[PDB]
């Protein structure tokens, strides 16, 4: 049948 | 500028945004929920002139702008424009930075989910607010009015929510939600005034009609008798001055527009009207609830400032209600300004400090957290 906050979070942590 | 990290409260509707800080009595500033854009080609050079205008800027420069509302029927459909409105609200007039303050936003209980989710994302991502909460309009109205039990009939610009609450709890099966609002009454008034020789079809004209409505229109206690006279004599007409010096008078149209709240068929809507839905919100609750909701009809939202509306809403429901029992309406001078007031009260409660979403939980869950933490 077939986020703007993720970017800022990374900047401060890096 | 504050001596505490007080929450900011922003009552963002489909009309105006009222904003200030928690713990105060009133918003610091109010803004049309508008982003304006020029519909003309610039001719002179070095005139400044923005690509887009926000809030009161958009309204003040409206002579050549088309004005859009990012919020329709209580929901944000345009969040880029809301980022602009909030930037303006917070940094230009309240002059605060949400980064250092929790922020409280408001919505109806059956407002589609995208509204609270996008509101949560904008405040946590563009303003980087330390905490968020999206509150229920009925809850906020009940705190402002001094009640835990009653029907909150919130007939504002967007939607009429009409939710019964008992002992601070929702009775959701009895929400007699209705897609009939102040914005439809404005549209009706533009059309009915067009019939009098004063066409209102452009943005500037729409803002004028909303201003006419707010100052000249009413619902009255008895429509048929009010129209029997208004339709027969000029003695019930009232004048209004337009920005260019034109004078418009309105006769029975002055109340026939607003009457659509009680007679929705006037604009082609299939509905029993706001008073029957208020009645049913009480009736659909358990029999040992009904007595307390009958005694506490809580009026809030917009349109509550039409002459005859509080008196009429009590008359219309007491007329449907059983005899012997007393039916009462609560309609304080804090009507419509009750959602913002409730935001200030709620944000400041010690028990509400367990309701706020922090910018911790937010990162692990994302903006969808609003559906786990708010209501």
């Amino acid at each position: 049948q077939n986020g703007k906050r993720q970017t800022e979070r990374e900047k401060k942590k890096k | 500028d504050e001596d505490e990290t007080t929450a900011l409260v922003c009552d963002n509707g489909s009309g105006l945004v009222k904003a200030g800080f928690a713990g105060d009595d009133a918003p610091r500033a109010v803004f049309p929920s508008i982003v304006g854009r020029p519909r003309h080609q610039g001719v002179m050079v070095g005139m400044g002139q923005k690509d887009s205008y926000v809030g009161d800027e958009a309204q003040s420069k409206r002579g050549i702008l088309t004005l859009k509302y990012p919020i329709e029927h209580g929901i944000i459909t345009n969040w880029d424009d809301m980022e602009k409105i909030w930037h303006h609200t917070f940094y230009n007039e309240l002059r605060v930075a949400p980064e250092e303050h929790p922020t409280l936003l408001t919505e109806a209980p059956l407002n589609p989910k995208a509204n609270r989710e996008k509101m949560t994302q904008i405040m946590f991502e563009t303003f980087n607010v330390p905490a968020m909460y999206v509150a229920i309009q009925a809850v906020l109205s009940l705190y402002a009015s001094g009640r835990t039990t009653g029907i909150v009939l919130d007939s504002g610009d967007g939607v009429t929510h009409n939710v019964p609450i008992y002992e601070g709890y929702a009775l959701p099966h009895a929400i007699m939600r209705l897609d009939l609002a102040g914005r439809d009454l404005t549209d009706y008034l533009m059309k009915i005034l067009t019939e009098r020789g004063y066409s209102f079809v452009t943005t500037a004209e729409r803002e004028i009609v909303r201003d006419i409505k707010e100052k000249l229109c009413y619902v009255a206690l008895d429509f048929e008798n009010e129209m029997a006279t208004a339709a027969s004599s000029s003695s019930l007409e009232k004048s209004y001055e337009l920005p260019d010096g034109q004078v418009i008078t309105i006769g029975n149209e002055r109340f026939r527009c607003p009457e659509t709240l009680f007679q929705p068929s006037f604009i082609g809507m299939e509905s029993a009207g706001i008073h029957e839905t208020t009645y049913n919100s009480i009736m659909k609750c358990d029999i040992d609830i009904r007595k307390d909701l009958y005694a506490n009809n809580v009026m809030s939202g917009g349109t509550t400032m039409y002459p005859g509306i509080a008196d009429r809403m009590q008359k219309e429901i007491t007329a449907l209600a059983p005899s012997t029992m007393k039916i009462k309406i609560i309609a304080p001078p804090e009507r419509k300004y009750s959602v913002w007031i409730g935001g200030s009260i709620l944000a400041s409660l010690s028990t509400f400090q367990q309701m706020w979403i922090t910018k911790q939980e937010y990162d692990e869950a994302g903006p969808s957290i609003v559906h786990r933490k708010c209501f």
């Binding site: 900047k11 401060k12 942590k13 | 070095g46 400044g48 930075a97 980064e99």
Partner: protein, 57 residues
Amino acid sequence: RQLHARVDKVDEERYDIEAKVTKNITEIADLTQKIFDLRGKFKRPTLRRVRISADAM
């Protein structure tokens, strides 16, 4: 070990403080230009060397 935890925390906080200063500087730069455009709005009508040649010629 406490110092390592402290230096890690202080730089996280430091980034946010520097960002806050940057944001206020940015607002001044933006406000300053709006003021300059408004200044031009009223000064412009007289920014000319005028009425000299009128008598000289």
